[PDB]
Structures are given as C-alpha cells and as structure tokens.
Design an enzyme around this catalytic site. Sequence first.
Site, PDB file in Angstrom:
ATOM      1  N   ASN A 160      -9.251   2.644   1.542  1.00 62.37           N
ATOM      2  CA  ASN A 160      -7.852   2.825   1.198  1.00 62.37           C
ATOM      3  C   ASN A 160      -7.674   2.653  -0.290  1.00 62.37           C
ATOM      4  OD1 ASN A 160      -5.212   3.144   2.828  1.00 62.37           O
ATOM      5  ND2 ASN A 160      -4.731   1.707   1.109  1.00 62.37           N
ATOM      6  N   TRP A 161      -6.794   3.516  -0.838  1.00 63.85           N
ATOM      7  CA  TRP A 161      -6.299   3.447  -2.216  1.00 63.85           C
ATOM      8  C   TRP A 161      -4.749   3.253  -2.137  1.00 63.85           C
ATOM      9  CZ3 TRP A 161      -8.829   8.297  -4.939  1.00 63.85           C
ATOM     10  CH2 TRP A 161     -10.219   8.031  -5.121  1.00 63.85           C
ATOM     11  N   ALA A 217      -0.115  -1.935  -5.097  1.00 64.66           N
ATOM     12  CA  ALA A 217       0.594  -3.208  -4.739  1.00 64.66           C
ATOM     13  C   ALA A 217       0.555  -4.047  -5.955  1.00 64.66           C
ATOM     14  CB  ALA A 217      -0.094  -3.950  -3.547  1.00 64.66           C
ATOM     15  N   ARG A 218       1.649  -4.772  -6.269  1.00 64.07           N
ATOM     16  CA  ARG A 218       1.765  -5.486  -7.509  1.00 64.07           C
ATOM     17  C   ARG A 218       0.803  -6.667  -7.554  1.00 64.07           C
ATOM     18  NH1 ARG A 218       7.601  -8.237  -5.948  1.00 64.07           N
ATOM     19  NH2 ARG A 218       6.852 -10.329  -5.628  1.00 64.07           N
ATOM     20  N   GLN A 228       1.395  -2.695   5.255  1.00 65.89           N
ATOM     21  CA  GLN A 228       0.713  -1.931   4.230  1.00 65.89           C
ATOM     22  C   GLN A 228      -0.786  -1.860   4.545  1.00 65.89           C
ATOM     23  OE1 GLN A 228       3.127  -0.357   3.268  1.00 65.89           O
ATOM     24  NE2 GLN A 228       3.409  -0.854   1.042  1.00 65.89           N
ATOM     25  N   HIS A 229      -1.479  -0.811   4.151  1.00 67.51           N
ATOM     26  CA  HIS A 229      -2.894  -0.622   4.462  1.00 67.51           C
ATOM     27  C   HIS A 229      -3.718  -1.644   3.783  1.00 67.51           C
ATOM     28  CE1 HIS A 229      -2.163   3.764   5.813  1.00 67.51           C
ATOM     29  NE2 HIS A 229      -1.819   2.852   6.764  1.00 67.51           N
ATOM     30  N   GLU A 247      12.307  -6.066  -9.461  1.00 69.50           N
ATOM     31  CA  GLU A 247      11.825  -5.150  -8.455  1.00 69.50           C
ATOM     32  C   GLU A 247      12.637  -3.853  -8.364  1.00 69.50           C
ATOM     33  OE1 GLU A 247      12.159  -7.667  -4.620  1.00 69.50           O
ATOM     34  OE2 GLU A 247      10.295  -8.834  -5.198  1.00 69.50           O
ATOM     35  N   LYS A 289       5.345   3.121  10.122  1.00 71.60           N
ATOM     36  CA  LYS A 289       5.149   2.676   8.783  1.00 71.60           C
ATOM     37  C   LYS A 289       5.812   3.537   7.675  1.00 71.60           C
ATOM     38  CE  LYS A 289       1.343   1.664   5.530  1.00 71.60           C
ATOM     39  NZ  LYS A 289       1.537   2.980   4.826  1.00 71.60           N
TER      40      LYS A 289
HETATM   41  C1  LIG Z   1       4.660   3.413  -7.095  1.00 75.08           C
HETATM   42  C2  LIG Z   1       4.689   1.962  -6.780  1.00 75.08           C
HETATM   43  C3  LIG Z   1       4.428   1.619  -5.417  1.00 75.08           C
HETATM   44  C4  LIG Z   1       4.549   0.280  -5.052  1.00 75.08           C
HETATM   45  C5  LIG Z   1       4.805  -0.681  -5.965  1.00 75.08           C
HETATM   46  C6  LIG Z   1       5.012  -0.409  -7.379  1.00 75.08           C
HETATM   47  C7  LIG Z   1       4.925   0.997  -7.746  1.00 75.08           C
HETATM   48  C8  LIG Z   1       5.058   1.414  -9.177  1.00 75.08           C
HETATM   49  C9  LIG Z   1       5.232  -1.616  -8.257  1.00 75.08           C
HETATM   50  C10 LIG Z   1       3.798  -2.267  -8.460  1.00 75.08           C
HETATM   51  C11 LIG Z   1       5.813  -1.401  -9.638  1.00 75.08           C
HETATM   52  C12 LIG Z   1       6.052  -2.634  -7.621  1.00 75.08           C
HETATM   53  C13 LIG Z   1       5.604  -2.966  -6.309  1.00 75.08           C
HETATM   54  N1  LIG Z   1       4.974  -2.011  -5.525  1.00 75.08           N
HETATM   55  C14 LIG Z   1       4.284  -2.389  -4.220  1.00 75.08           C
HETATM   56  C15 LIG Z   1       4.134  -1.343  -3.368  1.00 75.08           C
HETATM   57  N2  LIG Z   1       3.746  -1.639  -2.096  1.00 75.08           N
HETATM   58  C16 LIG Z   1       3.401  -2.916  -1.791  1.00 75.08           C
HETATM   59  O1  LIG Z   1       2.863  -3.207  -0.661  1.00 75.08           O
HETATM   60  N3  LIG Z   1       3.502  -3.923  -2.697  1.00 75.08           N
HETATM   61  C17 LIG Z   1       3.927  -3.669  -4.054  1.00 75.08           C
HETATM   62  O2  LIG Z   1       3.953  -4.669  -4.716  1.00 75.08           O
HETATM   63  N4  LIG Z   1       4.370  -0.056  -3.646  1.00 75.08           N
HETATM   64  C18 LIG Z   1       4.476   0.913  -2.604  1.00 75.08           C
HETATM   65  C19 LIG Z   1       3.111   1.332  -1.936  1.00 75.08           C
HETATM   66  O3  LIG Z   1       2.274   1.869  -3.016  1.00 75.08           O
HETATM   67  C20 LIG Z   1       3.374   2.432  -0.970  1.00 75.08           C
HETATM   68  O4  LIG Z   1       4.110   1.807   0.120  1.00 75.08           O
HETATM   69  C21 LIG Z   1       2.077   3.010  -0.398  1.00 75.08           C
HETATM   70  O5  LIG Z   1       2.390   3.817   0.764  1.00 75.08           O
HETATM   71  C22 LIG Z   1       1.030   1.951  -0.020  1.00 75.08           C
HETATM   72  O6  LIG Z   1      -0.219   2.652   0.351  1.00 75.08           O
HETATM   73  P1  LIG Z   1      -0.774   2.563   1.846  1.00 75.08           P
HETATM   74  O7  LIG Z   1       0.071   3.526   2.618  1.00 75.08           O
HETATM   75  O8  LIG Z   1      -2.212   3.087   1.672  1.00 75.08           O
HETATM   76  O9  LIG Z   1      -0.681   1.122   2.336  1.00 75.08           O
HETATM   77  K   LIG Z   2      -1.624   5.270  -0.060  1.00 79.33           K
HETATM   78 MN   LIG Z   3      -3.440   4.344   2.991  1.00 81.02          MN
END
Ligand SMILES: Cc1cc2c3c(c1C)C(C)(C)CC=[N+]3c1c([nH]c(=O)[nH]c1=O)N2C[C@H](O)[C@H](O)[C@H](O)COP(=O)(O)O
Ligand SMILES: [K+]
Ligand SMILES: [Mn+2]
EC number: 4.1.1.102
Lengths: 500, 500
Positions: free
Chosen positions: A165-166, A169-170, A187-188, A279, A388
Amino acid sequence: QPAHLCFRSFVEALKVDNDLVEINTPIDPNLEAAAITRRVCETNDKAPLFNNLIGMKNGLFRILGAPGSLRKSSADRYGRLARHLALPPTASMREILDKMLSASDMPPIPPTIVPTGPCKENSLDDSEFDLTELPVPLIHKSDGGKYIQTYGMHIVQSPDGTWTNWSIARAMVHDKNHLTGLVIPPQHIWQIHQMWKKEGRSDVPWALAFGVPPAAIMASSMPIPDGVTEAGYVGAMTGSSLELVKCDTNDLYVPATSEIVLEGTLSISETGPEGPFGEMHGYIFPGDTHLGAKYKVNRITYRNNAIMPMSSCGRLTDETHTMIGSLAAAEIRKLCQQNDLPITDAFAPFESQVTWVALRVDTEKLRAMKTTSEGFRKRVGDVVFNHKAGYTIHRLVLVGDDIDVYEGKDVLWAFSTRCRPGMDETLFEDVRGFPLIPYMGHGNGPAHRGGKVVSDALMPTEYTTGRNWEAADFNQSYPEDLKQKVLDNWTKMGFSHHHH
Amino acid sequence: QPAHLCFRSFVEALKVDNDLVEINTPIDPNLEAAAITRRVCETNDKAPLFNNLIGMKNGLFRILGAPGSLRKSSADRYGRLARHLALPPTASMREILDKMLSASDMPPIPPTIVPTGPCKENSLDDSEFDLTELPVPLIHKSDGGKYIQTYGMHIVQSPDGTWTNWSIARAMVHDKNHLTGLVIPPQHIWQIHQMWKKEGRSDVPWALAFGVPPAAIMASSMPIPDGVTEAGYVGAMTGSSLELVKCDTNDLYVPATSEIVLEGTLSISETGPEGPFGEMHGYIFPGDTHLGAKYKVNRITYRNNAIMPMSSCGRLTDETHTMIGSLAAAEIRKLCQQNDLPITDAFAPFESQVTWVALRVDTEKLRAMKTTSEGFRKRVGDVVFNHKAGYTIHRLVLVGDDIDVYEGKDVLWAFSTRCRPGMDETLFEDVRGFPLIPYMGHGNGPAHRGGKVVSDALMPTEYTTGRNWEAADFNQSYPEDLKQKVLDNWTKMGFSHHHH
Ligand SMILES: Cc1cc2c3c(c1C)C(C)(C)CC=[N+]3c1c([nH]c(=O)[nH]c1=O)N2C[C@H](O)[C@H](O)[C@H](O)COP(=O)(O)O
Ligand SMILES: [K+]
Ligand SMILES: [Mn+2]
Ligand SMILES: Cc1cc2c3c(c1C)C(C)(C)CC=[N+]3c1c([nH]c(=O)[nH]c1=O)N2C[C@H](O)[C@H](O)[C@H](O)COP(=O)(O)O
Ligand SMILES: [K+]
Ligand SMILES: [K+]
Ligand SMILES: [K+]
Ligand SMILES: [Mn+2]
C-alpha cells in the site's frame, strides 16, 4: 522524465507554466514557509518553491508548498492536478477524476525494479542524521510538533507480501530518530498494521518517500480498493511500469526518483504524543494531543538538492480539499455504479469543506426503477456509508440531471430548494463517522459513529414522469433566438475573457 | 427631491453613479426587456432603463429593471439599496439593515397631505384605458400572464381606518380592467382583506402605486409589525414626513411623486387565474395556474414620461433576494433580541436562495444562560418560526461570534463543520411553511406546514467555557508580526485593489 513520473520534472513544469515563485532568500521553516503557502492557498496564487530554507544542511532540504492547490483562472483552475497526470492544464475535474478511475477496469501494470536512481545520490545512516536538526516546518502556530510528513507516501506491505500500500497520512517529528502520526481505521496503513500486530513477531517494515512521482501521490490520496497495490494501479493509469529501487535497510521498494526517503519500522507496540494539527476542516484545537503511532527511522536517502513537498492545510483551498475530497468522490461514483445505482457524476463541494458529496442521478434510469425517495436514499446511504470510500463524507446530496455537481453554486441551489429538511433526508447513526470534523470529535455525540445523512434534492416527478419545471434564469426562461440577440447586442447597448 | 424620497430622482442618482444603461432603441416588453434585466441580475451589471418600449403610448410607460439588485464591485455591492435610503453607496449590509430597523424604537412621523403632485400630471378614466393594451412585460417565457406588478406598492387600509399597509405582492393583468395576484396568509394585505371580508359589506378600497419613494418600497418589502402603518415608519426612518395625495376615486393616499397609480378595489368575493410565475427560488412550474385575488382598476394616474420599475426575478441575484431575504433577516434579528435571545446579527445567505437565516450569537451572553443546544435551539425556533417575520425562512443557522453572517462562505464553513446532522438540529413540523419553495408546494409533504429546522453551528464549549479552537487560516494560525512581514514582502517575493 515526464512531469507525472518525476517530481523534479513536475517542479520544472510548474515553472514553465508560470505557476511557480522561486524564493531564493532565507525563509524560516518555523511558521514563515507555511504562512506564505497558506496565503497562496487562500488566494489561489502560484506555488512557492523555498530554495533557501533556514536550517537546510548537506542538501536537506528545499520546500515546495501548495503542490496540488488551485490556480486563479477558471480556464486552468485544476492545472496543478492536471500536471500530476499528463493531462492538459485546462482539464476539467470530470477529466481528472475519470483519469484517476481509469485503471479500475484495467489489468495492473506491476512496477519494474531498477538497480539505482536519483534517490540514492546521498545517504545518512543512523549515526549521521537527527530529525530534530532538519528544517522541518512548524505549519500552524499551535501545532503539537513539526509536521515533516504532509505530502509524502507511506509504503507498507502485508505480512504475506501480496499487497503493498501507498498512502498519505500525517506524521510529525518525535525525536532524533522517530516520528509519530496517524494510523487509524479504516485506512489501509491501519489495516496492514493490524495484520502485523496479529502476527505479533515484528514491527512493520516501512518507508516514507517524499517527492514521489506525481501520479503516485494522487493514487496515494485515493481510496482505491482493499488489497490493491497502488503501484500497479498507477502503472495502468499512466500506461507505464513505475521504476522502483530497493531500500537499503529493508526489502521495500521506493520510486527511483524520490526526493527524500526515510527507511525504518512502524511499531506494533509503541505510541507517542501526536497532534494537534491544523487540519482539512479549517481548525486546530490547541493542546488536543493524543497518542499516535510511532515510526523509527534507520536511514535517510535523498537526491542532490532534495525538495520536500508540503501541504499548509486548513481553510479553503489546499490539497486536503482538492485531492481528499475529489478522489473520494470519484471512488464513490464508481462504487455507486457497481452497486447498480444510476449515478453519473460525484463531487465534494468545496463550500461544504469537502464533507458533502453531490451525486448526479440519471433520472431516466431512476424512473425505470419505479422507487421512492425514502427507499432510494436508504439504498444509496447503505452502499456509501458502509464503505471505506464514504469514510470522510457526512452528507450525500442527490441531484437530478440538470445540476452540474462540479459547480458548488448549483449544488447549493438544488440542496436549498429541492430537499425538504427532515422529510427528504435519512439519518445514519450506525455507520463509521469521521472524527476530525469538529462536530464529530469535538461535538455533542460519539466521535466515531453516526452523524451522516442522505439529503434527497430530487424533486418528486423525477422518480415518476420527469422534471416539471424550468429554471427562472436567463438560460431556461427565454427562447434561443432572443438569448442570442441579447448577447449579440450586449456591449452595443452599454453593458460589460475566458482565459484570464 | 432627494433620491430616497422620489423615484425619478433615484433614477438620476443611478445615472450619476454610472450604474444605469439607458436603452433608447425599441425593446419588446414581450420577454426582451426582462431577458436583458435577467442577464443584468445574473452578472451584477448596471440597471437597464428602457426608454423606448414597444407598445408605449401616451406616456405609459418606460421600464427600469433591476432597481434593487447588486453592483459588481465589492466596495459598492449594495449601492443600489443604499440609494433607496440616503446612505453612502459603500454602506455595508449591517448599515442598511440598521437603517431599516431604526424606526422600530422611534415615534412614527405621520404623512403630510398635499393637494397635488407629479402623479396627477395625467389621468385615464375607465373609458380610456385598457390594461391589455399597455406594454406590460412578459417576464419569463412560461409565465401565466403579463406581470405588471413586481415592484409597486399595494395600499389597503383596515375597515376602522387605523392601519394603512404598504406592501409588495405580485399581480398580473387579467383583462382590460382587472388584475389577479397573490393575497396569502400571513401577509398584511391578506390580514386586511380578511377584515373586510368578515365585515361583508364591500370590496376593499385599493391603490397600487409604482415608482414610489425608494425608502417606501423598502419598507413595503419588510415585515414590520402587525398594525403598523408603513408611511409613519418610513417617516421616522428618513426623519421627514412623506408627502401624500388623495386618490381621485377613493380616499386612500398615494405618494405625491408616484410614477403610476392604479385606483380601484380588491374583491372580497371574486377570484381569477393567477400564475405561474418565475419566482425567487429560481423556478417556474409551467401550467401551475391557481385562483388568485382579483383587483378591479377604475382609474390610472401617472407622471409625464412615467417609468415602471420591474423585477425580473429568479436565480441569483435580484430584489427577491436582496430585499425579501435581508429585510426578513433584519426583522428576525430584532424579534430575537426582543425575546431576550443573545442574537447580534442576522442575514439570509444568498447561497441558500434566501431560505436560511444565519444568526450570530453573543456567546458571552449565551454562557451566562447556562443552557444547552437542544434547549436553546428550541427556544430560538419557537420565537422565529411562530412569527410572521420567520415565514419565508426554513432553516436557521446559529453561529458564534467569530462568524460574519453577511459572508456566505463563512456561514457555509460554520454550518458544514460545526452542526452535526440530526443531533445538532431540531425539526419544526407544526409551524407555517412557505409554499413557494419547491420542496414545499411541489414536494413530498404538506405545502403549508412544517419543513423547518434550527441547525446549531455553535460548538459545545461556546455554551460553557468559551471557544477552544483557532482557525487553520492565515489570520489565526500565524502571529501578527509574521503576517505583516509576509504581506509586506508579498509582491517583492513574486506573488499577486479595493475599489475595483
Ligand atoms: C492529500 C492528503 C491526504 C491525507 C492527508 C493529508 C493530505 C495532504 C494531510 C497529511 C495534509 C493531512 C492528513 N491526511 C491524512 C490522510 N489520511 C489519514 O489516514 N491520515 C492523515 O493524516 N489523508 C487521506 C488519505 O491519503 C486518503 O484517505 C487515502 O485514501 C488513504 O489511502 P488508502 O486508501 O491506501 O488507505
Ligand atoms: K491510496
Ligand atoms: Mn490503498
Ligand atoms: C421585494 C419583493 C417582495 C415580494 C415579492 C416580490 C418582490 C420584488 C415579487 C413581486 C417580484 C415577487 C413576489 N413577491 C411577493 C411578496 N409577498 C407576497 O405576499 N406576495 C408576492 O407576490 N413579496 C414579499 C413581501 O413584500 C414581504 O413579505 C413584505 O413583508 C410584505 O409586507 P407586509 O409585511 O406589510 O405584509
Ligand atoms: K426532495
Ligand atoms: K411591509
Ligand atoms: K453544534
Ligand atoms: Mn405591513
């Protein structure tokens, strides 16, 4: 290398587009860089490239703010997003979302392993770096840490090796060799972490790559399905196998042109203070620190003259709106279609702080279903809010074919005029809620459950015989030949350009 | 005569403001005039003055469109409304609403009777006019009649003589000597009509004056209290007694400088087809004709070179938004304050199609009340939705002191982020509803009852200890000295006027 495949080339593309301001005088990563970037995002200005960051040493690091934010003109409003994807800079949101969905009915194109790349140009072992000594930004004045990770990609793999997974997440600096960050359901990164925890034998091998291929950071921000390796989805979308290099200290693979890579482990046992952070919904709650996941960094590798992307997130408009909202909406559109719901388009209005998704209905198909609002709302809400892809979204607005869901003014018009409060809505209290919305985690009810609604802005005859109104607007209330006459005589009479 | 006291002078003021386009070539009242005006309203262009109307004869009539619509620049956005009231053209909405409320704790200044005025320059008895022969506009292509009356003032008086009401209500030509229009509860023209009907002895003496003093047409559009004669309220507001002349055929009094006056009777027994009309919420339902009130016209008097104002109403933004919404909001603000609710400001966001009112709460006072959201929402909703001033409004949004309710973006941010759907809302089903909202009269439920909600966008600590967040925005997330540095260096670094 093309801009969509190489972050360094993306930065060049923004320059060439006259969409970049290079700041070559010293800028402080303590608030200044982020304040400039915040003002850029609130004004839809050019992206800032901070070439002279106070505290930059031995190549770590420059900062690019606002990588996925909006441009001022309407004609290329989404151009920065288009430049992540090899699309023309005038691409519509529909075209961008269709591009992001395109790989969903393609065979993956798995990545190609290469022996080296620019990300290996420099390295620092565990005696040679200190995360507290890097120019990591303080993004908001009340943040509980310096958030190194706002626009990098976490890489974790299931224990069985079958899913890599890519995702974004902060994460923030905890000490010289650790980060803390969010790892939360559904989340993945959380799902994979839980598989390692159940196995119980080791910490999760991990890497965090910053300045990855733009097409990869978009898929990183998209809720593509469980078990789907993003690298292969991105390969299919772009029509090319992504070039990856093995980490030095583990067996994960990172994009060859990554600007900066952290290698290490995500703990299955340890936590540390994380947050607060300003946020996506526009708020910070000073002093609200909670325990987050803990990452150990063992190695840093990086390009010469490495650039760290940064999201200065908050009030409109930044990457948390343009990417989180839009890409969730895209996935919801597809989910609805795959569940045989007559949804043509989906978008998260910015005006809703990307907490709503508007769903455009093919009302001809709706009519053939011979259903009612109560029934249809319930079906749509069960599909979306139990998945999800619906996680971040608290209100779904159903609209008919006359509404362009990519235009917030029209969504607000339809919501305000076509959905009777209460009667035309169905509340969902037994679904997963998004705790970061203030009314959830800082509200009157459970932080993690409920608070969702389907608002039906379909009019009654849209279910039965068809639309039975005309808009009281210039377009619909006057015949074609008159409209054209008025337009043709407009400036001649005394009244007041597309690109702008 | 001053612009706020004389419509002819108002028109001059718009010219002088470079806020008028005079069209001296022939324009068709069948759709063309209204189509031009519609485009003006959708673009915030200059007001059109149609000096050469096809079908104009013997002085009846020219048309002014968009009298109370918006200007393009932010600095004088509400200038046309300011020109109704002797305010500077840069007046804020708060200043405009405060002006409109100012007479509520002043003694009335009753009108002055004068023997003649410009409205007597020409006359046509009941052998000399035919309403079907005048250049009355067709405003929307599907309208069920030619709506002569979109911006005149109906004048009716209680049987006992003690209350003379001035109000806007639409009306269309029925035949050579009659109009049909809306006379509906809880409106004051309806309330007075009901008093005459109960007495049962005669039709209601009536006049309709077009091109009245601008300050009078604003009070005509405002829900000032039951039993309050608008002429005396306007006198107090402007500090001057309004000059009125007696009608020729009845004992009502009309503004001396009225452009056009119709004298006659509003029937206590007869009705006729009325509507459909393209309305304030943005819709017309073709073929939806219903029986309306019926007016008989006995006499027309008019100024030389008479000008008829016209509202080409519909989608944003026109007089039905700027005046109906804002003036209801003003009255609601006052009502709340008089019921000891800690409301500082009220506005009907345009984005809501003026179906919401945002209520700004003095949260220091709220805290002293030691109350809860459920309780407070119920109290606010009972006060407002059981009162005539709340008639047109279906959603009230409660916001704290940080939100500028005159800025729709901030109201939408607070609603979307601070009010949990369902839990933070109270539905009102046993109140009078506004049937013209499509989800009411063309919706799934009763047209005249319910469909209202109070949405509480106050956060929990606003009731208890105080706001516990900072915005994640440029203003609140960075110290003063940094902000100022960024602003001072903005253009020097490479980034991008008030009047515009
Ligand atoms: C673009 C973007 C996406 C953030 C994000 C931010 C940005 C800039 C931040 C870093 C500025 C602030 C917080 N973010 C989180 C985040 N998801 C999460 O689980 N925790 C985070 O802390 N996301 C959302 C997450 O990337 C999406 O829900 C994806 O679907 C996660 O991928 P996955 O489906 O493979 O789990
Ligand atoms: K993703
Ligand atoms: Mn994924
Ligand atoms: C500004 C404005 C106000 C309209 C109006 C229009 C405009 C331009 C139109 C003519 C273009 C379309 C319809 N309108 C009606 C209307 N009220 C009503 O009872 N019937 C109407 O047909 N109103 C609202 C009405 O004027 C306000 O509710 C007043 O408070 C009524 O005065 P009252 O309080 O003395 O009854
Ligand atoms: K509906
Ligand atoms: K009135
Ligand atoms: K609330
Ligand atoms: Mn009245």
